[PDB]
């Protein structure tokens, strides 16, 4: 039972739910790997177990498990799988799911909010073109002008016999990243594979910095297909400063909507290639990572330039003044465009609330320290002087390989 | 099987094999990672201790296998099979503080770890002749403000003797004053230690920078007082390059940071008293010391002043203030012509220290939690850097406050 102490308050806790922890993380006694970004690499008894276990935990949380529907439910999915080799969950069990993958996210910061989430059932989605139509829906609800609303899309899940459902790309929102002459890119570095399985499928390249990639959706066993999102359903927000005026010259964009669509879904057992969720942004994510990693934007030593910092020496802070200033950037032009933001600060303060809550509720929270405390301040917020158990619950999202 | 490490930044990939002779076991396990907490934690065991330092040491001169190499572990063996224990010779006592100085996951300074001076101190006989070592370390060490990294290495644990103990856990601390509301004047890190200097005869003041006396513990005896030469104790006042009001505030810190109450290992040899001392990389002293809520906490003060909109978090004032305190503390520092380092050189450093280490050694235990400094973490290179983080020995280690 680890013990664990908040060191700006003096505060003891005791994790009781990591004891419950079921599929092994990648650390050992000899040695811990909680820094790699992807552990490990990336008879249906196997299922029954699975199935069971997602079951007790529903009928408890519905506050009274034992004989009831939760005996009925227990030998309607063992007959299924008997009869199928999969099973079915019913609409409500996908919802707490869903809601419960969520709540289990380690390196989710946002989870505050986990109860408060729309499923959109799309289990009956036979075609690509019925793909683009549910996540054209989802990107509308989700979005609502601005007033971000959480939701995930839940496509069919893995059937032994053939077919999975895949969207290709990491987002649904993604700007192009163009190889240029130099071996240097146009756009966004981390998205230079997408763009060009984009173009080597049909795509016409597009001029500049931000250009909205198109969805690669693939439905079973056909290869997939190329669809263009209609700009009036993609909401940006340009970058402007609230008295850096020279700020929006530099013609900085972000889009509204944060909506991952490459990690399975996993609920008793059952495989979902295809889940795209989407909530709303930290603004230390767009600000610090997006903008202001190496590998990334990497418009730092633009913006430093343009405040007259002196960039010829470290100890003159330029690339933390910078820094601060495209948050705030970030921070400003969200609230002007009315588009949901948090900043880092109210988003770890509301962290630990969530821990307190999950430590009466539950008996503790998975938590991932390097992933929880934000990018920039870290020691100004108080999840930097929190310690934290991170082990992997389940229901889940994990990483998947991808589909090349 | 050895764990594959990537860097983010660059696309690199590398393999820690030296991850597979991690000598102690740490406190995560597959059903869950430990690695963010604080403090995790006969005759034959210290003898194969003792046989891989050896080892150790004849590898770093290029003579294993060496007639030399095999006289010393034969030698070794003879001694700790007559008396239970073995003492270190000189040379090896060099290489082992070196080593364990090498091994800190935890520790940005390591590019270093080669450059150390070592003074022994293992013929110390009472509380008085450690407090005179010390000060000559903390002369050696300030050296007027262009610092050297050192540490004098008191006599080894040894059966039938109690050990060498130094309180305090820093050669240079401020007195925390707990006061009747709750509150603290000075530094509320400090306030155990201050209460036990008071009771030890200790006049105490009401300043917030009050430098506080050595407890020094010889075996077996009461720890005592000493006072330190007030010209021992190098401080820099902190003022800000364009902001002139921040002189008023009345800060202050110190030149050396030496920390005084860790246990050193080597080759199964356990030192209690072995203080060693640096330099100070700025975000400790402007975010950890000066801004943690718990510690001297005046990033309010210094925002308010700065005329921020301290009524929203989204205005970044926090941020904003704790960048300014940060300038300001390497100003202050150059000013006073002390040695510092900020967190994109101590960072970039490191990074070229891992090269250094994956090419020497195939890896290198870094503890990532404390490498990412505690400000502006991924505009730095080891933000992007996975590592790997596990207990070689010689080592550093805490160990229970001895009252
Ligand atoms: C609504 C506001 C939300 C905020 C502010 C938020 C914030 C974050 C942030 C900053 C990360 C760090 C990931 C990275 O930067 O690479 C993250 C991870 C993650 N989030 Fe949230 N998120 C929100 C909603 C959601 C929702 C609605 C879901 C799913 C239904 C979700 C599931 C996840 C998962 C699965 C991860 C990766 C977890 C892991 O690898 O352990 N989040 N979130
Ligand atoms: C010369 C410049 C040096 C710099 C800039 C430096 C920097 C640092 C910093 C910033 C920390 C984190 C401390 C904290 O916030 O708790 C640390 C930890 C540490 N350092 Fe260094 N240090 C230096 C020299 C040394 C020396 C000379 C030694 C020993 C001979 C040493 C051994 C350690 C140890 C044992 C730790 C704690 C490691 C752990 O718990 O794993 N350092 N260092
Ligand atoms: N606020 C968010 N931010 C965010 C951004 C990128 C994310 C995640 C979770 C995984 N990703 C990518 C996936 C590829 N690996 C790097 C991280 C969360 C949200 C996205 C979706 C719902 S909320
Ligand atoms: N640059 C430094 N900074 C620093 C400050 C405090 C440190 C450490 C390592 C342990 N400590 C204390 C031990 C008690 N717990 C708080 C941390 C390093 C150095 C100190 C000595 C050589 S370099
Ligand atoms: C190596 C390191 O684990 C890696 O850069 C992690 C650290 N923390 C992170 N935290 C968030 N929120 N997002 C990330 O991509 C990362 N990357
Ligand atoms: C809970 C958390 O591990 C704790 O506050 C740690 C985090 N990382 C740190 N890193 C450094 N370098 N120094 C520290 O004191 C801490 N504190
Ligand atoms: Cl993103
Ligand atoms: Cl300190
Ligand atoms: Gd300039
Ligand atoms: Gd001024
Ligand atoms: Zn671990």
Redesign the interface.
Known sequence: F?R??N???GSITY?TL?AQ?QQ??????????????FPRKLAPEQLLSQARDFINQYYSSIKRSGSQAHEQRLQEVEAEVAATGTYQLRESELVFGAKQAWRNAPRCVGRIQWGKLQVFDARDCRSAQEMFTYICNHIKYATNRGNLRSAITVFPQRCPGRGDFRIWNSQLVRYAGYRQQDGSVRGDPANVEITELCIQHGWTPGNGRFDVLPLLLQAPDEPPELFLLPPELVLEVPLEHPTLEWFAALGLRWYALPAVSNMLLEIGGLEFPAAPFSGWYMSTEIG??NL????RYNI?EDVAVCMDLDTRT????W???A??EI??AV?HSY?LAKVTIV?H??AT?SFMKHLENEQKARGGCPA???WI????????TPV??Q?????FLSPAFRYQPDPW
């Open positions: 680890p664990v102490k060191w700006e308050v994790d990591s922890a092994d993380g990648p650390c050992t006694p000899r040695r811990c790997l909680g820094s790699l970004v610090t990572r202001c990693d190496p590998h730092l470290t100890s003159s802070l690339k933390d003044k820094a601060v948050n705030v921070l609230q900043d600060h109210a303060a991932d320290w390097a405390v934000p990018p920039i301040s870290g020691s100004l930097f002087h310690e934290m158990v991170n082990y």
